[PDB]
Amino acid sequence: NPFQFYLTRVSGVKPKYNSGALHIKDILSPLFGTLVSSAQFNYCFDVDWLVKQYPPEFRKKPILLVHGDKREAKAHLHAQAKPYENISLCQAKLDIAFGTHHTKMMLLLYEEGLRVVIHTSNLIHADWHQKTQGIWLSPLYPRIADGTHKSGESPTHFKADLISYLMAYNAPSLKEWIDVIHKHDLSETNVYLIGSTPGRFQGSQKDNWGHFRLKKLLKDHASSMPNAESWPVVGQFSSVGSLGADESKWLCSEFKESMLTLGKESSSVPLYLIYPSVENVRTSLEGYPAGGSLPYSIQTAEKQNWLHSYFHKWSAETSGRSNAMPHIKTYMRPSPDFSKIAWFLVTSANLSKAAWGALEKNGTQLMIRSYELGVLFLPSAFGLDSFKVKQKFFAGPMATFPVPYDLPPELYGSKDRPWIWNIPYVKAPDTHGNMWVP
Numbered sequence: 001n002p003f004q005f006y007l008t009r010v011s012g013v014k015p016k017y018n019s020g021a022l023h024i025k026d027i028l029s030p031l032f033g034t035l036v037s038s039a040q041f042n043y044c045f046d047v048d049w050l051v052k053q054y055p056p057e058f059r060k061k062p063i064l065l066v067h068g069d070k071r072e073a074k075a076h077l078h079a080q081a082k083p084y085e086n087i088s089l090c091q092a093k094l095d096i097a098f099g100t101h102h103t104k105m106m107l108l109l110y111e112e113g114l115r116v117v118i119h120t121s122n123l124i125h126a127d128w129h130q131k132t133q134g135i136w137l138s139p140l141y142p143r144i145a146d147g148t149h150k151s152g153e154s155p156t157h158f159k160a161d162l163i164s165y166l167m168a169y170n171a172p173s174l175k176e177w178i179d180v181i182h183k184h185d186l187s188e189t190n191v192y193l194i195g196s197t198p199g200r201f202q203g204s205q206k207d208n209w210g211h212f213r214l215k216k217l218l219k220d221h222a223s224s225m226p227n228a229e230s231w232p233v234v235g236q237f238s239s240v241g242s243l244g245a246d247e248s249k250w251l252c253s254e255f256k257e258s259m260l261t262l263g264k265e266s267s268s269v270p271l272y273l274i275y276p277s278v279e280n281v282r283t284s285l286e287g288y289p290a291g292g293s294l295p296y297s298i299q300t301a302e303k304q305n306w307l308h309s310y311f312h313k314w315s316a317e318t319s320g321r322s323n324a325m326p327h328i329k330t331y332m333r334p335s336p337d338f339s340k341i342a343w344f345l346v347t348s349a350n351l352s353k354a355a356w357g358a359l360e361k362n363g364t365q366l367m368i369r370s371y372e373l374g375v376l377f378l379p380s381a382f383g384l385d386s387f388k389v390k391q392k393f394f395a396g397p398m399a400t401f402p403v404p405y406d407l408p409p410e411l412y413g414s415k416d417r418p419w420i421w422n423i424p425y426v427k428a429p430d431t432h433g434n435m436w437v438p
């Protein structure tokens with residue numbers, strides 16, 4: 001397969017559903033390269049657990065943790081890392097209120113080259129245990145010979161775009177990694193980077209980040225087809241922000257408008273949103289505690305009940321993961337019969353203005369609160385007009401894209417409700433015999 005899109009291993013499913021999945025111990029294995037140094041970008045860390053995931057022979061190599069914690073949270077993380085003299089920390093600046101360092105990325109420097117891993121899991125045991133999570137694995141990027149002058153750039157501009165994303169941190173520890181990336185050849189990369197960084201972007205910079213970045217790539221590197229109005233948009237996520245009092249405020253006016261872009265020329269497009277129902281959570285492998293990683297508040301939800309008519313259940317028979325609650329986030333553009341897709345995005349970004357950006361100043365400024373990162377698969381980057389959807393995720397041409405959940409998505413029933421994490425559920429017990437009392 002050219003796509004190098006993986007799911008994490010799920011404890012308790014049959015082996016056929018983990019053959020081809022990756023655990024963190026597999027990613028860090030000496031089989032992937034001889035580690036010299038690594039950077040772990042994430043939101044939440046269990047440092048004791050994380051170090052044990054490295055091979056014992058690599059556990060004293062330098063590790064940089066890139067996080068967004070402040071005040072007592074920052075103090076707690078430093079206390080976690082203090083026992084390990086090889087661990088350094090980088091606090092990403094969050095100068096806009098209510099922002100989050102949400103990006104999940106590994107930079108892995110080897111004796112043999114460099115690897116980039118962009119994924120969706122926190123660095124804690126539970127996120128790699130019984131959840132549906134996504135991973136993109138870069139090729140092994142060889143080093144450019146000293147004295148040789150070449151760009152090492154891919155047709156998707158991934159090298160410059162990754163350096164641009166790291167430059168936005170304005171951090172000395174990340175300038176070191178920028179210099180590492182400069183010395184490697186990333187020309188085999190076939191995905192486009194889509195990042196968010198905090199700020200207020202106008203003019204030339206408006207297309208650099210968030211949903212305007214997605215719009216620009218789809219304008220420049222996708223083509224519109226006849227009946228494009230019939231090709232749905234699918235969004236799939238683990239958290240929902242405050243989107244406004246109706247769909248015209250953001251969801252269907254700028255978010256959907258960016259998502260439905262195809263090609264360069266100047267809506268009835270169906271919008272499917274996939275988010276676990278209460279029943280999905282109750283009957284999951286984890287039970288109700290899976291809802292601790294689905295942070296949708298009652299105070300947010302009751303201001304936007306209009307949104308829930310867009311919601312579809314989590315179902316993933318194709319990958320054996322219907323009971324493995326999703327922490328992956330994905331967005332895609334299927335055909336009207338869901339047999340093909342025009343593009344696929346795996347990202348850290350949930351369905352929120354903080355992650356994707358919201359227009360300000362009479363539409364001239366895109367404001368983003370958070371750090372996010374994902375990779376976009378476009379058929380043009382593989383010499384194709386569209387991707388065929390793989391019928392079974394772990395089954396056997398390799399030019400079919402492995403969509404990890406079932407199509408078409410199934411609408412909530414009349415008795416279904418979205419998972420809301422801070423209200424009680426005491427009518428029926430979960431798979432472990434328990435209720436949910438926040």
Ligand SMILES: CNc1ccc(C(=O)O)c(C(=O)O)c1
Nearest residue numbers: 043102122238239293294295
């Ligand atoms: C908006 N509140 C969230 C904070 C952190 C995370 C994470 O897992 O990093 C998530 C999520 O991805 O569901 C949401």
